Amino acid sequence: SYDIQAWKKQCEELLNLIFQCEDSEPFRQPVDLLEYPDYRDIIDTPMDFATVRETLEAGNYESPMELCKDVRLIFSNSKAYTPSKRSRIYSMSLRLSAFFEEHISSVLSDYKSALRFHKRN
Numbered sequence: 001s002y003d004i005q006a007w008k009k010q011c012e013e014l015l016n017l018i019f020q021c022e023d024s025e026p027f028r029q030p031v032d033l034l035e036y037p038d039y040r041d042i043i044d045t046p047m048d049f050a051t052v053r054e055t056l057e058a059g060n061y062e063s064p065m066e067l068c069k070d071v072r073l074i075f076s077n078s079k080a081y082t083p084s085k086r087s088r089i090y091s092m093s094l095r096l097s098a099f100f101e102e103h104i105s106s107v108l109s110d111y112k113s114a115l116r117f118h119k120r121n
């Protein structure tokens, strides 16, 4: 399965599944400072799933590793901000992260395999 470009539609498909998840709803759009006025004291680099989808659709990811770094930033920001490990929203982030990681592993493996096959000779 040595298609170097296949990761892109596989990531579009996985972002579609994440948007159906009720657990994604807090992570879809950038955090509102009005409601969370200390957010940007704690979080240097905001990230959300709409920004990830738009970066993908613009052709501004070169690999699924770059997409994976930005999605992992959504989850590390939720960890950096939770006032408690037992917060509702952090708890939603942990389930959504498990789902993401379960599905992205084959996307990454197949991409890396395809690049190695391209460089085989």
Ligand SMILES: Cc1cccc(OCCCNC(=O)N2CCN(C(=O)c3ccc(Br)o3)CC2)c1
Pocket (backbone or CB within 6 Å): 025, 026, 027, 028, 029, 030, 031, 032, 035, 036, 077, 078, 079, 081, 082, 083, 087, 089, 090, 093
């Ligand atoms: C106009 C409109 C329409 C529809 C949705 C929309 O966006 C929803 C609000 C965006 N989420 C949000 O506010 N947060 C998500 C990220 N945070 C945490 O991860 C976190 C950890 C513990 C706690 Br508590 O929060 C901080 C809160 C905006």
